[PDB]
Design a protein around this ligand. Structure first.
Ligand code: K
Ligand code: K
Ligand code: K
Ligand code: K
Ligand code: K
Ligand code: K
Ligand code: K
Ligand code: K
Ligand code: K
Ligand code: K
Ligand code: K
Ligand code: K
Ligand code: K
Ligand code: K
Ligand code: K
Ligand code: K
Ligand code: K
Ligand code: K
Ligand code: K
Ligand code: K
Ligand code: K
Ligand code: K
Ligand code: K
Ligand code: K
Ligand code: K
Ligand code: K
Ligand code: K
Ligand code: K
Ligand code: K
Ligand code: K
Ligand code: K
Ligand code: K
Ligand code: K
Ligand code: MG
Ligand code: MG
Ligand code: MG
Ligand code: MG
Ligand code: MG
Ligand code: MG
Ligand code: MG
Ligand code: MG
Ligand code: MG
Ligand code: MG
Ligand code: MG
Ligand code: MG
Ligand code: MG
Ligand code: MG
Ligand code: MG
Ligand code: MG
Ligand code: MG
Ligand code: MG
Ligand code: MG
Ligand code: MG
Ligand code: MG
Ligand code: MG
Ligand code: MG
Ligand code: MG
Ligand code: MG
Ligand code: MG
Ligand code: MG
Ligand code: MG
Ligand code: MG
Ligand code: MG
Ligand code: MG
Ligand code: MG
Ligand code: MG
Ligand code: MG
Ligand code: MG
Ligand code: MG
Ligand code: MG
Ligand code: MG
Ligand code: MG
Ligand code: MG
Ligand code: MG
Ligand code: MG
Ligand code: MG
Ligand code: MG
Ligand code: MG
Ligand code: MG
Lengths: 61, 101
RNA sequence: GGAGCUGUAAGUAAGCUAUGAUCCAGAGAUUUCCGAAUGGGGGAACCCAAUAUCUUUUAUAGGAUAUUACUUUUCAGUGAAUACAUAGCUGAUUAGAGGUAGACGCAGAGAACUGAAACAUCUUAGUACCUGCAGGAAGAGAAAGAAAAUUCGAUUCCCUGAGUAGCGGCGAGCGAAACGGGAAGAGCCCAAACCAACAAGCUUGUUGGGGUUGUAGGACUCCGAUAUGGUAGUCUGUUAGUAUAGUUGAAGGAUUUGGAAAAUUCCGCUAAAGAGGGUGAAAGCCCCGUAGACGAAAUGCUGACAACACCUAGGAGGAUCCUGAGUACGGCGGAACACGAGAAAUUCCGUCGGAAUCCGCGGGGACCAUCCCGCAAGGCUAAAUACUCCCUAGUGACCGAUAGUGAACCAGUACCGUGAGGGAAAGGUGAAAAGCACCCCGGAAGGGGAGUGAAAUAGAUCCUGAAACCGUGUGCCUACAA
RNA sequence: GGUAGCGGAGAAAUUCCAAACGAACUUGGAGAUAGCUGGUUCUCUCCGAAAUAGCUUUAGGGCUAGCCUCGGAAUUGAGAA
RNA sequence: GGUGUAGUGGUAGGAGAGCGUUCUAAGGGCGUUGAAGGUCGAUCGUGAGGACGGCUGGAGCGCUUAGAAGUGAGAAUGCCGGUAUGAGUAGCGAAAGACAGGUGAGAAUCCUGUCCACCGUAUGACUAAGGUUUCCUGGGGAAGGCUCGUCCGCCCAGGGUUAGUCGGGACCUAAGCCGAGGCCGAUAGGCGUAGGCGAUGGACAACAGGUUGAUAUUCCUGUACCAGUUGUUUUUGUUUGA
RNA sequence: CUUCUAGUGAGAAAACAACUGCCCGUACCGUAAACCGACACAGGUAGUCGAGGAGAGUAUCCUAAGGUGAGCGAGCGAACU
RNA sequence: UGAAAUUUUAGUACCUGUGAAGAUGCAGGUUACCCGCGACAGGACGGAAAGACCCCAUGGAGCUUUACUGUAGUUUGAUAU
């Protein structure tokens, strides 16, 4: 699915709150990016969140 | 059943009370028994049973097992039956005399 | 277990059974086809294959057996663009799929009617529904806690706090927690520092040791002990008990009514058994039972015992090192906390920014100082708790055939609908079929006799047999009345 | 054979979507809500109204008061004619 | 308890006291010498209601005190069942039948015969779907048939569908559908490549006659064709190789 | 299906004789009393054949092959429809 | 052979009047022997359908828009990649 390959961040549901506090359901998605990374020594394109990449600990082959 | 085919029994209840006879047949599932010359019924038969008259046949009908008592063969009296193992064999015993069967 | 048995289910027919049948319990064998269905296909219960062995035929055709899905794990070989490689492909190996119990648990997603006497915040409600994952329970759980009586010492659940404190178009409503009393109780592992080995490329990964914490702990350095205890382990036995068949189990005869005695009457007897059911009416003593005693080849379950297994060290020093980072936390936007952004802590999600590290860090409801309490960003953990599709044994001032399950009866049937789906009606002869032989009218049906039966106006539409409704007979009245 | 209800399809009529379509059918939320209509089963004894005021998104609803009933307390007896 | 005085219509509604139903407890009873229930009666009480007889019935049931309620029906266009009224009424669903003979308990209605009449681009003959035994033979007349019925597409008992060539499969594909990997996506899943499935189309070897009560390009007779196996014979090729 | 080579190849071809050839459907109704309409229902139901005279004709009338006489009737011969 | 709608029980007249104001059923009077059959449709405010017109309910639904509050989309900026 569309899930961060390393941290598991995934789409969830939230609320839209108007000034009158009317509530309607919305979807809140993580900032995923397709990235070519070395998994088990073989490069692959997987979904990765910008937060995971932030530390720089994620390979960027 | 505490009574068995071929036993001599005494009828203790029913129209034939105090009669005695041999057990012609036993029906454990129904808990009933047939005693010769006991509880005779007249049955209006068609001639369809190899009887070229139909006629009104006489036959003993079963009676409930609890309405009979086994005849103590040695004494000839009706008795209740206990169970004692004799010579490694489980057998019936007359509570009135201790006789077997 | 010990005499009948071949279900319902009669009837024939043919048989089995003391060489122990039928029947009951344990274990095992077989178990067509469809179905996750998996060799391929398919409109389920059907069709068509490949490989290898076997089989029929002189031979083809035919038949049987085994293997042949997909993905995941590990391994091996092959092997592109491309040189090495990798990918792909082949094989072997590994464990998943699906169904449930219309229950219980956790999670993702998540209404509306309704209430507010309208309605949008709010309420219904994180409910119904859907989906995922489960386990016999789940979830939680070993304090960056509760507190400030001075103290308590994991979690869960019950009572109480209390309809309180609070939240709330401050409306309608929503609504705690701690303390206190109980049920039950249990605590443990890593990461890191550091050490030894291994391998490559003085560090850097693998392995083993090491170590696990807040009255700070640990490494490290000195000392001294190589014990002491424990466990939530094991298809390890041995043993006991228990579940799944069973055996035994006391004591009544007469008299009256009756078709039939258990009822009546007269004398008895038994009781560790006077629970209950059946038997021709109401039985302590007729039967099945009950009290009580006894019983297991086989297979589970539990408990013990042992074995194996796994954990289990004290003291003194701090010079130095370690103690969980894109984490905690902050801005923005949501959400959970009884708490609807509010003065708003605490918890969580998305996004962006982004620490300290023992002189350290978090919390005590904005925030700061002091004080107190604790040590996050890693994991596991029984019991008390929730539920019952099922199995066993019982209970009921629960129903008694329009009731009680929709279904007491061949019911989720008949029937209805394209389908999802909706969904009935229908129990009672008699003690025993003894279910009316024979005769008579009639083509039969159906009757009248004759019989069975205590009773046939109990005759199978069969207990009782109300009312509506229909008809026969007639005591009185009725054809000048509104 | 395909398109399915927050929809489809429509040479367009709110027209068709399994004999009723301004939003199919079935099951569930669900015993929706109904200030509205209907119904609510034995007897006797004692007493016995109201159809008014005020306010109301209130007017055939409701709340307090007025009028009825049952029990109680007390009084310098306060009521009626 | 007696006397006296006063009072006693009543909807909404308040209060009080009772009747009856089922069940529980206790006590005390009744029942095949007939319980409950049903039915009839000219019976008792102030009311709900309570007795007692006769008959029916055939096995359970009162009474007293207390207790608990699925505790009382006449109305809800209430639900279910039964039966009425309308009423011996509407209707008996497009059209021609007549008679003789037969069968039989029974005939307008069944069979046979004769004449008559109707359809005849059909009301005839084949087939696909659909139905699923309704087909044939022998019985039956309960129910079904809008009458009747001796008869039936009904009931009962037996029996009937024969393929190398026909249609389908072991052949092909269209639309559409499924879909290894793959893409996408809160979950579920959506989409789709390879590859498959899928006729209404393409491809494909047999016809004539006869036979049964019921099958026929299926059985039989005659005469064929298509794919293949074995074998005999005949030719020709064996690795410059058909 | 026909060709082409690539590959494959020690057997091929012809005639003749004998022999082999699996599964599923096959009954019956089918402009209907057997299918869709709750009915033995004046409705609906794809395709093929579908004759003669007159006729352009499958129109029309009467007929052939063939099928059928319609599952309540007997009287009477009023109103009214 | 054999239904159905309807139906509180009916021994079911006329006039004038009365009455919830339009009577087969009430009052006064009048007329009328009992039971049917074939016809007609004035009445039973006849049957069928809890009026669709009208009004009401702090009912419902579909629709409109510069009604209120939201929102899918579309677009613009900041920020991450
Ligand atoms: K399958
Ligand atoms: K359950
Ligand atoms: K709402
Ligand atoms: K309201
Ligand atoms: K757990
Ligand atoms: K409370
Ligand atoms: K309010
Ligand atoms: K250790
Ligand atoms: K007995
Ligand atoms: K007994
Ligand atoms: K055992
Ligand atoms: K907050
Ligand atoms: K705190
Ligand atoms: K603390
Ligand atoms: K009887
Ligand atoms: K009479
Ligand atoms: K149209
Ligand atoms: K009586
Ligand atoms: K009623
Ligand atoms: K009727
Ligand atoms: K009638
Ligand atoms: K016949
Ligand atoms: K074929
Ligand atoms: K075809
Ligand atoms: K055939
Ligand atoms: K011509
Ligand atoms: K013609
Ligand atoms: K006829
Ligand atoms: K006439
Ligand atoms: K006329
Ligand atoms: K009126
Ligand atoms: K009229
Ligand atoms: K509407
Ligand atoms: Mg044995
Ligand atoms: Mg398969
Ligand atoms: Mg509201
Ligand atoms: Mg399990
Ligand atoms: Mg005994
Ligand atoms: Mg006695
Ligand atoms: Mg909240
Ligand atoms: Mg944040
Ligand atoms: Mg904080
Ligand atoms: Mg401390
Ligand atoms: Mg637990
Ligand atoms: Mg029932
Ligand atoms: Mg009954
Ligand atoms: Mg029912
Ligand atoms: Mg009688
Ligand atoms: Mg009867
Ligand atoms: Mg006169
Ligand atoms: Mg007179
Ligand atoms: Mg319009
Ligand atoms: Mg329609
Ligand atoms: Mg609700
Ligand atoms: Mg009064
Ligand atoms: Mg008075
Ligand atoms: Mg009773
Ligand atoms: Mg009741
Ligand atoms: Mg009634
Ligand atoms: Mg009439
Ligand atoms: Mg007709
Ligand atoms: Mg014509
Ligand atoms: Mg026939
Ligand atoms: Mg026949
Ligand atoms: Mg008939
Ligand atoms: Mg073919
Ligand atoms: Mg697909
Ligand atoms: Mg896939
Ligand atoms: Mg062909
Ligand atoms: Mg035929
Ligand atoms: Mg045929
Ligand atoms: Mg027809
Ligand atoms: Mg003609
Ligand atoms: Mg008037
Ligand atoms: Mg008048
Ligand atoms: Mg009168
Ligand atoms: Mg009237
Ligand atoms: Mg009317
Ligand atoms: Mg109305």
């Amino acid at each position: 699915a569309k899930v961060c390959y390393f941290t598991g961040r995934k789409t969830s549901s939230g609320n839209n709150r108007s000034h009158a506090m009317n509530s309607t359901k919305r979807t809140v998605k993580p900032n995923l990016q397709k990235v070519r990374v070395l998994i088990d020594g073989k490069p692959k394109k997987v979904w990765v969140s910008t937060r995971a990449l932030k530390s720089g600990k994620i390979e960027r082959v | 059943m505490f009574v068995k085919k071929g036993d001599k029994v005494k009828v203790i209840t029913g129209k034939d009370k105090n009669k005695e006879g041999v057990v012609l047949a036993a029906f454990p599932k129904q808990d009933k028994v047939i005693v010769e010359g006991v509880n005779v019924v007249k049955k209006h038969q068609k001639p369809n049973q190899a009887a070229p008259q139909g006629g009104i046949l006489e036959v003993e009908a079963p009676i409930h097992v609890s309405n009979v008592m086994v005849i103590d063969p040695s004494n000839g009296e009706a008795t209740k039956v206990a169970f004692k193992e004799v010579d490694g064999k489980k057998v019936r015993v007359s509570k009135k005399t201790g006789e077997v069967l």
